[PDB]
Design a protein around this ligand. Structure first.
Ligand code: OIN
Ligand code: OIN
Ligand code: CHT
Ligand code: CHT
Ligand code: CHT
Ligand code: CHT
Ligand code: CHT
Length: 311
């Protein structure tokens, strides 16, 4: 909705001039959309810009005041004629690199020999976050790379691979909200259920998020590292209590013999018993190591070879 002007070629740049003024930022002109930066030069190709539509960066000319405004920046694609690609689904385009972004009409730059499928939101911006494609989930980076007073927005919108945290983010990471870990394979597909990664087992369930701590899966209990997620095995001291996990990771309950020694893991909680305890009417004593006492005396009471108390 900007009329009364005309495009102008001058000094190897292109502008839109009306009543002798230069257009700047966003403008809707005769069915298409263009962006002319801060001083009027029409942009082309990949651009990381403040979202249009609010009016604060729209329909403006260099002879008008430009207000302070905090608008998020996102990725957009413009044709070589300056027209914004108003895609709302997806399109295969030249990959955005460190040498084909932020260019203006008349500037010289290479065209990526590599192309990628880019997804877009309903407002023509490159889409970020989770997406569901052909039976699988994919994660499109929400953030670029940080580096001590440094930030590179290039990775944004790209398909994430490997271990990835899904932070809540607008202009910055919302550190108050949760940021679960996920794992996307070589083609970007999100993994589910049990998975062995870098020599260790992890559980991503049905939602994909990496489990931590105790987890009940298909009738058994597993303990995934509270912080790292990796599945534990063997003896583990958790919450001031001992537990024995099979090599499969599953928690053991009942009587267990380690070498020659017998231990009793609580039927309900699975925690190792110490002191005198009773099993199915019978009485037994386990030392502080959890080790069952056999054929000997304990503070006056005798126990046979099965550790059973005998009157
Ligand atoms: C392979 N994963 C482990 C370490 C790298 C990723 C992240 C996983 O989840 C985490 O919480 C780890 C714990 O060290 C982590 C590493 C670095 C920053 C934040 C979290 C564990
Ligand atoms: C939770 N269960 C699944 C993943 C671990 C356990 C047992 C099965 O997985 C395995 O048996 C794998 C096979 O490589 C395994 C890895 C390391 C030691 C033992 C078994 C299914
Ligand atoms: C992978 N998700 C879409 C499925 C679930 C949590 O974000
Ligand atoms: C033993 N737990 C994993 C089973 C239950 C919480 O006390
Ligand atoms: C079971 N008792 C007879 C053995 C010991 C006291 O708790
Ligand atoms: C750790 N312990 C006391 C539990 C068991 C011996 O392997
Ligand atoms: C000897 N028991 C009581 C310890 C274990 C099952 O045979």
């Amino acid at each position: 909705n900007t009329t009364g002007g005309r495009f102008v070629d001058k000094d190897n740049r292109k502008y839109y001039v009306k009543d002798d003024h230069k257009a700047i930022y966003w403008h809707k002109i005769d069915g298409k959309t263009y962006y002319f930066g801060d001083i009027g030069e029409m942009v082309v190709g990949w651009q990381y810009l403040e979202i249009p539509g609010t009016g604060y960066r729209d329909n403006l000319f260099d002879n008008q005041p430009v207000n302070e405004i905090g608008l998020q920046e996102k990725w957009y694609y413009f044709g070589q004629d300056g027209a914004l690609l108003e895609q709302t689904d997806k399109q295969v385009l030249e990959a955005k690199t460190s040498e084909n972004t932020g260019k203006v009409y008349g500037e010289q730059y290479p065209l990526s020999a590599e192309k990628r499928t880019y997804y877009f939101d309903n407002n023509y911006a490159v889409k970020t976050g989770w997406i569901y494609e052909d039976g699988n989930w994919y994660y499109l980076n929400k953030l670029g790379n940080f580096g001590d007073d440094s930030y590179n927005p290039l990775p944004i919108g790209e398909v994430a691979k490997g271990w990835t945290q899904d932070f809540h983010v607008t202009i910055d990471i919302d550190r108050s909200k949760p940021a679960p870990w996920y794992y996307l394979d070589a083609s970007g597909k999100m993994l589910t259920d049990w998975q062995k990664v870098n020599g260790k087992w992890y559980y991503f369930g049905s939602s994909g998020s990496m489990a931590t701590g105790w987890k009940y899966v298909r009738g058994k209990w597993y303990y995934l590292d509270n912080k790292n997620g990796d599945m534990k095995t063997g003896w583990q001291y958790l919450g001031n209590k001992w537990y024995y996990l099979r090599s499969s990771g599953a928690m053991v309950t009942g009587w267990y013999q380690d070498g020659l020694t017998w231990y009793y893991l609580n039927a309900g909680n699975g925690d190792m018993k110490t002191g005198w305890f009773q099993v199915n009417g019978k009485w037994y004593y386990a030392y502080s190591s959890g080790a069952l006492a056999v054929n000997t005396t304990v503070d006056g009471y005798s126990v046979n070879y099965n550790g059973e108390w005998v009157q």
